[PDB]
Amino acid sequence: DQPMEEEEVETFAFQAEIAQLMSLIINTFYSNKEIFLRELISNSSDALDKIRYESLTDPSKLDSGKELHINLIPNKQDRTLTIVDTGIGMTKADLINNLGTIAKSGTKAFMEALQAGADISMIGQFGVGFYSAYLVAEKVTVITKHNDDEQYAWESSAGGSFTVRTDTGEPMGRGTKVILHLKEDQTEYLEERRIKEIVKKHSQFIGYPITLFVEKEL
């Protein structure tokens, strides 16, 4: 009897600054936790900008999907909140390297301000907003599909490492799917009215459709 499928699973250490940052986020109390959703949507919007732009000179880039949008899917039953976009997606290298974005040089000073007791809200200004996910999530999975590349799954419960592997789950056309497995004490971010108010307050100037799908298995 032979395997249905095989693959390598690789485990990586986070770069030092990012590991320190994740530790600060997880072990320090902050009031303004809701900004995590702002930061993920902003990431999605940047990814959509990137594919929109490239498609200008290469329309075939959109064969994997023409619609550019952001979907929010709370699933109380699984205690997950998923953010899905149809942006440019990430290569394996992009996932490894801070999820497709360059951590800014001021990140060091940012963390020092944090250890001095600064707020977390500016985190997205330094190219590391993604990690605000861990203000509300105990585990995060990222599924991503970039043109002319395989679908990958990234995952970390923090602790200083993440894994990357080709994803053999359900296929995405193109883009990035962020699945937050929420902490017991942060399930409010599964509530559709709470999500609506957060989008309203922090994501007014996102120039793509943002659509809430409240999921309930029957």
Ligand SMILES: O=C(c1ccc(O)cc1O)N1Cc2ccccc2C1
């Ligand atoms: O795939 C992602 C991504 C990462 C994290 C996320 O939360 C949502 C996302 O779509 N990105 C590709 C790309 C290209 C240029 C600039 C930014 C980005 C962000």
